[PDB]
Amino acid sequence: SHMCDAFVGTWKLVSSENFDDYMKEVGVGFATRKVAGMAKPNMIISVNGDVITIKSESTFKNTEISFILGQEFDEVTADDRKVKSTITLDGGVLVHVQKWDGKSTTIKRKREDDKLVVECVMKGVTSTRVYERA
Numbered sequence: 275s276h277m278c279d280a281f282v283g284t285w286k287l288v289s290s291e292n293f294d295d296y297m298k299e300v301g302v303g304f305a306t307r308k309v310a311g312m313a314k315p316n317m318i319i320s321v322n323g324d325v326i327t328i329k330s331e332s333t334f335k336n337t338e339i340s341f342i343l344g345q346e347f348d349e350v351t352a353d354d355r356k357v358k359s360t361i362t363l364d365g366g367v368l369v370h371v372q373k374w375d376g377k378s379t380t381i382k383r384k385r386e387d388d389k390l391v392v393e394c395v396m397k398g399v400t401s402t403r404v405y406e407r408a
């Protein structure tokens with residue numbers, strides 16, 4: 275048993291709050307915000323040794339990241355930003371920081387009851403995205 279066991283699995287988005295405002299704060303344009311805001315992504319998390327893989331699949335885009343905790347990597351986000359990402363574990367919470375164009379956003383993923391709760395923060399704006407097991 276290991277680090278992220280309770281995150282591993284296939285998850286489906288069941289609720290979202292303030293995601294449009296988060297996307298605005300990030301700089302996402304109108305058409306992408308409207309189309310991306312409809313999606314109910316599946317998040318598939320797996321671990322193989324030190325390598326964590328998070329796939330996110332939706333009608334809008336399929337994305338995939340693989341990474342080692344604490345080790346920066348390149349990520350192309352669903353809204354087509356080219357970012358430099360670092361993901362760490364902080365007291366059981368996966369903390370994902372994305373840097374691009376002098377900007378920064380942080381995405382936190384945590385287990386709460388039977389849900390996986392995703393909190394996306396850009397300056398003063400937070401969006402909460404709740405996933406349940408598929």
Ligand SMILES: Nc1nc(N)c2ccsc2n1
Nearest residue numbers: 310313330332335337352
């Ligand atoms: N693949 C993918 N991943 C995401 N996080 C989102 C959010 C809206 S659409 C979408 N598609």
